[PDB]
Amino acid sequence: TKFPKFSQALAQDPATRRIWYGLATAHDLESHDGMTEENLYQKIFASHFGHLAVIFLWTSGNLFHLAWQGNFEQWVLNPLKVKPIAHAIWDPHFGQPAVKAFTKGGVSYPVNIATSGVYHWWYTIGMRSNTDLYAGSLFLLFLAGVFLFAGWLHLQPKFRPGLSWFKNNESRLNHHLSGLFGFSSLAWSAHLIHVAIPEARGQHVGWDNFTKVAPHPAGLQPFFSGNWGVYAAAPDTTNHIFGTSEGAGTAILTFLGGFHPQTQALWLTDIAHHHLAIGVVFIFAGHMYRTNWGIGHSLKEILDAHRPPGGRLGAGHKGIFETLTNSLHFQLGLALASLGVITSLVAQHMYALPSYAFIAKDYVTQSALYTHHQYIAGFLMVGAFAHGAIFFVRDYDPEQNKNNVLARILDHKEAIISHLSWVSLFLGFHTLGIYVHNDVVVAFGTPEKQILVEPVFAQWIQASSGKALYGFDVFLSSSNSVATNASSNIWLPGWLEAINSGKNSLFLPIGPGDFLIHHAIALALHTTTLILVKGALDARGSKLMPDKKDFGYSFPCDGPGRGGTCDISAWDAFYLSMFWMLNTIGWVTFYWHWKHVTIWQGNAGQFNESSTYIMGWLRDYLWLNSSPLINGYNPFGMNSLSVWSWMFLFGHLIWATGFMFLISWRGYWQELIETLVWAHERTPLANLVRWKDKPVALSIVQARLVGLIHFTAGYIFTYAAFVIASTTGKFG
């Protein structure tokens, strides 16, 4: 058996555990036999190339499947009535009524209705026909092939980079900030000015004419003259019909603010100046570090020099440079945390300030996008903490970090965990007490006895942004404030028009239910942070197991001795925190979907009166919106929601299956497999057939992971089916 060629210990396993553990440790290159650091970095570089190629192939596949089987050319003409098609259906297990019921979108074959929002994004950036969609798919296929060839090439001899090249922090930071962030943003601003804005104004720009069709009538002469404000003159009129010249302006760079009154999305000129400014700022950031020419900053000197002289941080940040450069897991945790924060930021800011034309009226698409990127955010943050725990297990050198900030985290880890526990118990005790209190007093016929705290802090913030609903009369809601007079000539009219109109999701009105659900969200975030931080900081050892770092990041237990040591590793803390992450994104998406459905229905008072107690959530959101989902198929017929009606139940099945690997444990199943081995060995006409690997029960860590996987898949598929089918049944 030589499948796990990277592990001799796994390859000598005589049982079925070998295949599973080779599958689960295949990409754990640091644990492989005889792995050196240079080989590790080169394999990581090529794997990153392969993932980039996979992303490009997926995007090219989306573009191609739309150019072939979509209705983009029909959808551009009538964006607010035509249902967008994701891809075609060819399933031979279908009966005829299922073929009939999925034939939508103005085509003659069964199709799925798109929820990804690629129509609005591609239409906003200037694609109009199916031809350029196919050309973009071809370009991304070619780009993916180029990156596959680069991944092969940069592993070939005399091209394999050295460890000094990989650990060049200053050069990589300068090039990735100035070029990968800055010049990419400048080029996207260029694409918006040169292509997207003219196509938004009904004038065709492609590769055949973009060198002869000026983005602005005055050309680049106002840019080279320093009369840049000429590019701000004659913006798009409030009567502008998107994709046509009727009411179109000539400006290419404005900061008008608010939304286009027809598309209910941000002005494209604002997006172009934003990405231009982001490019300029990032190129200015990308000249900061010294690479070859004496000027620039040194990262080691900046880290060592910022030690506060009062001694409250100890030695400050001395040794953090080598600890960060030498540990890929510390870097991975930092990157995953920052990525999770910004995809949460994307999820909040894109529903609140949409940039794609007509996507604010596509309720299913907004729900799917928010839910998707928020679940991605939870996964990324959990991964950040998990790989930080791996950094403490594998890479943390105390002797290189004497009196460091990391060492001082470790020296007051008990205070951190105890105060996290205190705030988690505080939040849970009083939030659950208010919710149960409201339930009990509403059930007894006295809703006037509820404890309803007005969220005056966030309402004050909304008034500071210009919301005149609450009468706070402060900052942008004050017509005499210095901020109001400062911004009155630039952006205040459009922003005030967008924030004080109740037709969008810009700073939606909030009440006691919003207060309670944000404090529940704070409870869940603090508790997940408690589990993850306690796992990371106790990863090296505890009072029950002071030599945990000798046993690695993942192991089942330390035996029944010393009272019992079940789930003591930091991997087990990851495993416990995954449920709480699913709970937190569940609460967030429940709040988002119920509030947005009640506003879209014109029945926001139902949310305002029912969200203060749990029975309102169970009845008016879960039970009430389940009716089109559970009627996707029935004894009277079926319709297009039936697949979600299947998938919903599918989730309710697979979620439950996870429980069996999380409740029942190993020895029972192992003895059953002994009985099955005896049965197969003693049965005639079947003992002629022999297994090559001995059948064994799944290991403890493997069973925890498999139960987690079935649980998580059920969670995701159940909520996705519910949100899409419910939004479609109410609004589509």
């Binding site: 640091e30 792995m35 050196t36 650091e37 297990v393 594998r394 890479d395 943390y396 050198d397 105390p398 290189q400 002071p546 030599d547 770092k549 000798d550 081995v677 005896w678 060995e681 003693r682």
Partner: protein, 138 residues
């Protein structure tokens, strides 16, 4: 040496006995002497009656043999038991007691295997021994 001609305890048979891996990979044997014919519990499930005199028994695992040895030690005061490992080629490897003296009693000539010359809290952190074949013990 293992005498293959030692008679076995009287057993009616069970489904818990050794599988094909005993005749293919390895098998274990336990011998002991009893002062009388008496009923004992099989480690694979069931009751057997051991004869007066010598008894030879075959098992699939060493732990089953040592469980039987512990059972007859604490219930019948039998300490002369010997456990052997038998391969399909017929080579017999004596296992327990390895030097004739039980492992809980000190015997001369035994050498310490796996002994570490410091406390467990003096083990190395993984960061010293990453990308290096040095042991965590030092």
């Amino acid at each position: 040496t293992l005498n293959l001609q030692i008679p076995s305890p009287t057993f009616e048979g069970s489904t818990g006995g050794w599988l094909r891996a005993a005749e293919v990979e390895e098998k274990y044997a336990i011998t002991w002497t009893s002062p009388k014919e008496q009923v004992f519990e099989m480690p694979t499930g069931g009751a057997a009656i051991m004869r007066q005199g010598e008894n030879l028994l075959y098992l699939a695992r060493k732990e089953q043999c040592l469980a039987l040895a512990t059972q007859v030690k604490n219930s019948f005061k039998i300490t002369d038991y010997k456990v052997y490992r038998i391969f399909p080629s017929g080579e017999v490897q004596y296992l327990h007691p390895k030097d004739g003296v039980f492992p809980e009693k000190v015997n001369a000539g035994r050498v310490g295997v796996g002994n570490v010359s410091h406390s467990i809290g003096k083990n190395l952190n993984p960061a010293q021994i990453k990308f290096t074949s040095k042991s965590f013990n030092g």
